[PDB]
Paper text:
Glucosidase I removes the outermost α1,2-linked glucose from the D1 branch, and then glucosidase II (GII) trims second and third α1,3-linked glucose residues by catalyzing hydrolyses at the Glc-α1,3-Glc and Glc-α1,3-Man glycosidic linkages. Here we performed an X-ray crystallographic study of GIIα to elucidate its substrate recognition mechanism. The overall structure of GIIα is composed of four major domains and three subdomains: N-terminal domain (residues 31–384), subdomain B1 (residues 207–256), β8α8 barrel domain (residues 385–737), subdomain B2 (residues 484–526), subdomain B3 (residues 559–581), proximal C-terminal domain (residues 738–823), and distal C-terminal domain (residues 824–977). Taken together, our structural data revealed that GIIα can recognize two kinds of glucosylated substrates, Glc-α1,3-Glc and Glc-α1,3-Man, via a bilocular substrate-binding pocket with a tolerant +1 subsite.
We expressed the recombinant GIIα (residues 31–977) in Escherichia coli and crystallized it by the hanging-drop vapor diffusion method. The crystal belongs to space group R32 with one molecule per asymmetric unit. The final model of GIIα refined to 1.40 Å resolution has an Rwork of 15.4% and Rfree of 17.5%. The tris(hydroxymethyl)aminomethane (Tris) molecule derived from the crystallization reagent, also known as an α-glucosidase inhibitor, was accommodated in the putative active-site pocket located at the center of β8α8 barrel domain. The Tris molecule was bound to the pocket in the 1.40-Å-resolution crystal structure. Similar to DNJ, it interacted with Asp443, Asp556, Arg617, Asp633, and His691 through hydrogen bonds. The α1 helix covers a β sheet comprising β12, β17, and β18, and, the preceding 11-residue-long segment is accommodated in the putative active site pocket of β8α8 barrel domain, suggesting its involvement in substrate binding. A unique subdomain (termed B1) is found in the N-terminal domain of GIIα but not in the other GH31s. In subdomain B1, residues 215–235 are completely disordered, suggesting its flexible nature. In this domain, a continuous twisted β strand (β43) connects the β sheets with β42 and β44, forming a β-barrel-like structure. These C-terminal domains appear to be responsible for the stabilization of the β8α8 barrel domain rather than for substrate binding, given that no interactions between these C-terminal domains and the active-site pocket were observed.
Numbering used by the authors: 29 to 214, 236 to 898, 902 to 977
Write the structure that this text describes.
């Protein structure tokens, strides 16, 4: 590695963070503090779902003002948007220092990058009341939501169900740093040039941060703003036992040996926060791409939040501030977690339909050293009956760190290697990063430069800095021209050695710059549009993943298929583009434990296709740690083992017995559940539903679930997992959320019924703690195969899990896994309902029964086995069920097994013989 001992700005070393914390400190200390911002009421108009007005900020004691245009939008979804800009900058009436050509206006293209829907204004929104001091707009479903805009001082309260839920500027922390010239007087130490990390930011605009206090009234838990090594329920940041002392930071960065339990930034940022309490949820999305900090405090609503004499109800106070751009905030009023995340996904995108194979097990390290190493690992996985889908090539596969090349010594036959993988339906993933080596005899860099596709410096020169290849330039993927050029580099006939099973890993896209400040670009670099790097930093990774995504749609004439791209850096909207992982984690138990809250936070922030490196990246995991890590990793939506260059080889067959057998059983469970995992991804695509779901999401009425972040439900299955993540543990305590019956997935032991509680479950090394909730049906594939592609035509097993209602529902989505034919209806989506002794299968969307090639071939694929857990006693002695499908009726044998000790009664129907694409009805009893 280049950097050994890294320097990260603490809040006090970030000028605009210092200024905004100081602004908060002053406002909280001041007596009868009034925000110096007022709506000029005569400038206001409401029409057709939108309020527009001028906020006047008073900027000195003479009462001089600047004009800050306000726009409040009320969207058909019931979401609201509040935007504040700065008129002098809209007009261009400022002067940038240093003869800079940077844009004068406040960055206003975050919307262009992030927002894909949800923007229709609600012409049903209406002013309920309006005088010279305030106005209330009714909006949302049946006009149930209200926003009360107070003019002087400016504030907005967002209300429903007879209460305020979210307040803007209640504490008076609104801060829009208006443009000023650099003048010596007739505290400005952070206003202009700032130095850190071996770099001086020329700061041509001076101060321009935007900040606001957002209060969540009556909420004691807030969630989101990934990525951090931190609990799902976010910590306070202004001190106290078990709290942080610095704000959560979002400034995508390459953080060497990142630590646990910290508000420090990691590699990606999604500035979306939710607040949840029993039966009420709200949220905000802060649409800003610049460095952003969020302070969080909790206490009573009184100015001294520890005062006596006041009601105890807790308000969570949050203080958001970004270096530049618009103040631009979306407000979600729920009332459930599912509602909020759905509405957020309508705005920023749902999860892309994945390549099916990408849900399988990925095998990676730094590095497989040759094409022969790759082919050998492939063979050994099969020798050891460990299924996997993809083998990965880290940076040593390239010729001297030039992307779009292969090391000729070590990778002489990449097509041969590809074809070997293709023999089991397996894939290859190759790393490609945004740093393009600055060297002679390299057409990729020649074109990057001559076509003006590289990121620029403060004076418009091509930026140069160091990364893996040494001296490099960076693709400016903000430029559509750069994205279009990038597409051309990936065609199979151009990127020699690649073929139809080759997909792509994007890394170091924060961007990582080894000699740059905080290992990234200078803030005064310039991008396409003449935006400063400060304006757009948190978007950078996403623009690069975007470029690569679009490059993989078609790589030869007539091809049109789903990309698979892994990214390190990301933003709101990256869910449209592929997977993420949590970067360079460490081979230790605390990082295994921490992975679960991190991966959960990803999904509730609308980017669920997420995982952590299995085994941990840095170091050498003990055999038990590695084994437990597989048992956790099979529940990551993105499931990959990876290891640092100095770490011992740890392909899973190297572990030794008994670990090999336990790891193989974990892999087989992941594969068996693939039908249900894929269906979970379908729901993420349809409406932004998380793939693995925390308790707050599934059980919004159960208050005790709010701080729980070590257990989760899988998709739409009712499967409740709590992996073991502690050394030498041989049992686990699972929180049972409700009064439903819960069954051990493996033994059908009844773990709980009738009442929410904590249950202790035996959990030796060989146990994966996994429960099945009553009321659910899920599909699996029992026949073990070497890869997901080799399962494609195999029969399904349905597991029907009954509680006392003897009623259940679930679903199964299947398609060709690769094309966009799903857009034209070429898929199977079954809704399974058990009710009144009958299991039925119907099309999920109610479509009437034109079959393409894939649908036709699926006519050979059946449901063959049904297992009913919690089978009623009345079925005892009955030797058949009656099956009806496609006009034919027949008996199928059923085996009834009575309850025994704590094991549930269960019944098994074998050789059901019904095609999965057809309606059916099966009557029991
Ligand atoms: Cl002005
Ligand atoms: Cl749910």
């Amino acid at each position: 590695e280049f950097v050994k001992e890294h320097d990260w700005k603490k809040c006090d070393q970030s000028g605009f963070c210092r200024r905004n914390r100081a602004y908060a400190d002053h406002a909280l200390s001041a007596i009868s503090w009034e925000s110096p911002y007022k709506i000029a009421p005569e400038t206001g108009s409401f029409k057709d779902g939108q309020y527009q007005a001028i906020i006047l900020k008073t900027i000195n004691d003479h009462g001089e003002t600047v004009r800050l245009p306000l726009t409040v939008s009320f969207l058909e979804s019931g979401t609201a948007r509040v935007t504040i800009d700065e008129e002098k900058r809209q007009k261009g009436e400022i002067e940038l220092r240093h003869d800079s050509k940077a844009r004068k206006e406040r960055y206003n293209e975050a919307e262009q990058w992030v927002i894909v829907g949800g923007m229709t204004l609600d012409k049903g929104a209406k002013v309920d009341y309006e005088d010279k001091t305030q106005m209330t707009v009714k909006y949302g479903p049946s006009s149930k939501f209200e926003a009360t805009i107070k003019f002087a001082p400016f504030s907005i309260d967002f209300k429903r169900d007879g209460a305020s839920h979210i307040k803007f500027n209640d504490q008076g922390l609104l801060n829009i740093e208006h443009w000023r010239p650099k003048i010596d007087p007739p505290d400005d130490s952070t206003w202009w040039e700032e130095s850190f990390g071996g770099n001086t930011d020329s700061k041509p605009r001076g101060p321009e941060s935007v900040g606001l206090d957002i209060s969540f009234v009556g909420y004691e838990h807030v969630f989101g703003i990934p990525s951090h090594a931190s609990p799902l329920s976010l910590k306070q940041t202004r001190g106290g036992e078990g709290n942080y002392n610095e704000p959560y930071r979002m400034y995508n960065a390459d953080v060497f040996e990142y630590i646990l339990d910290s508000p420090m930034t990691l590699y990606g940022s999604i500035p979306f926060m939710q607040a949840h309490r029993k039966d009420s949820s709200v949220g905000i999305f802060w649409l800003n791409a610049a460095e952003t900090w969020v302070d969080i405090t909790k206490g009573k609503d009184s100015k001294n939040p520890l005062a006596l004499g006041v009601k105890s109800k807790i308000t969570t106070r949050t203080h958001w501030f970004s270096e530049s751009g618009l103040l631009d905030v979306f407000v979600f009023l729920g009332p459930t977690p599912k509602d909020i995340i759905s509405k957020y996904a309508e705005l920023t995108g749902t999860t892309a339909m994945p390549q099916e194979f990408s849900l399988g097990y990925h095998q990676c390290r730094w590095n497989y050293v040759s094409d022969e190493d790759v082919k050998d690992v492939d063979r050994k996985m099969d020798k050891f009956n460990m299924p996997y889908d993809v083998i990965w090539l880290d940076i040593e596969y390239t010729d001297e760190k030039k992307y779009f090349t292969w090391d000729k010594h070590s990778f002489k036959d990449p097509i041969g290697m590809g074809k070997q993988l293709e023999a089991h339906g397996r894939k290859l993933v190759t790393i490609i990063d945004p740093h393009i080596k600055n060297t002679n005899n390299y057409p990729v860099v020649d074109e990057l430069k001559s076509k003006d596709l590289a990121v620029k410096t403060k004076d418009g020169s091509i930026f140069e800095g160091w990364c893996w290849p040494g001296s490099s330039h960076w693709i400016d993927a903000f430029n559509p021209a750069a994205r279009e050029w990038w597409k051309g580099l990936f065609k199979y006939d151009k990127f020699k050695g690649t073929m139809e099973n080759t997909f792509i890993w994007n890394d170091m896209n924060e961007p990582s710059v080894f000699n740059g400040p905080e290992v990234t670009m200078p803030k005064d670099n310039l991008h396409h549009g003449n935006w400063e790097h400060r304006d757009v930093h948190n978007l950078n990774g996403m623009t690069f993943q975007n470029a690569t995504y679009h490059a993989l749609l078609s790589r030869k004439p007539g091809e049109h298929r789903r990309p698979f791209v892994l990214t390190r850096a990301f933003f709101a909207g990256s869910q449209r583009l592929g997977a993420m992982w949590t970067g360079d984690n460490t081979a230790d138990w605390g990082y295994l434990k921490a992975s679960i809250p991190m991966v959960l936070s990803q999904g509730i922030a609308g980017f669920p296709f997420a995982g952590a490196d299995v085994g941990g990246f840095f170091g050498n995991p003990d055999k038990d740690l590695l084994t437990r890590w597989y048992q956790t990793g099979i529940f990551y939506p993105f499931f990959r083992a990876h290891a640092h260059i100095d770490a011992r080889r740890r392909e899973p067959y190297l572990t030794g017995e008994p670990y090999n057998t336990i790891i193989a059983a974990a892999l087989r469970l992941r594969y068996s559940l693939l039908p249900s995992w894929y269906t979970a991804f379908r729901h993420a695509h349809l409406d932004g539903t998380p793939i693995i779901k925390p308790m707050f999401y599934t059980h919004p009425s159960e208050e005790a679930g709010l701080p729980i972040d070590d257990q989760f439900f899988i998709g739409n299955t009712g499967l409740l997992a709590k992996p073991v993540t502690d050394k030498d543990r041989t049992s686990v305590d699972i929180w049972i959320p409700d009064s439903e019956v819960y069954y051990d997935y493996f033994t059908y032991d009844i773990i709980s019924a009738a009442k929410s509680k904590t249950a202790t479950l035996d959990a030796p090394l060989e146990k994966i703690p996994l429960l099945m909730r009553g009321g659910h049906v899920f599909a699996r594939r029992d026949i073990p195969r070497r890869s997901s592609a080799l399962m494609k035509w195999d029969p399904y097993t349905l597991v029907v899990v009954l509680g006392n209602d003897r009623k259940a529902e679930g679903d199964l989505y299947v398609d060709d896994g690769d094309s966009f034919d799903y857009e034209k209806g070429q898929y199977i989506h079954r809704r399974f309902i058990f009710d009144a002794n009958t299991l039925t299968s119907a099309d999920y969307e109610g479509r009437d029964d034109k079959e393409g090639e894939w649908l036709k071939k699926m006519r050979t694929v059946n449901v063959e086995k049904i297992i009913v857990v919690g089978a009623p006693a009345a079925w005892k002695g009955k030797k058949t069920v009656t099956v009806e499908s496609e006009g034919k009726t027949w008996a199928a044998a059923i085996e009834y097994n009575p309850a025994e000790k704590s094991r549930a009664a269960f019944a098994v129907v074998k050789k059901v013989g019904v095609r999965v694409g057809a309606d059916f009805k099966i009557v029991f009893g």
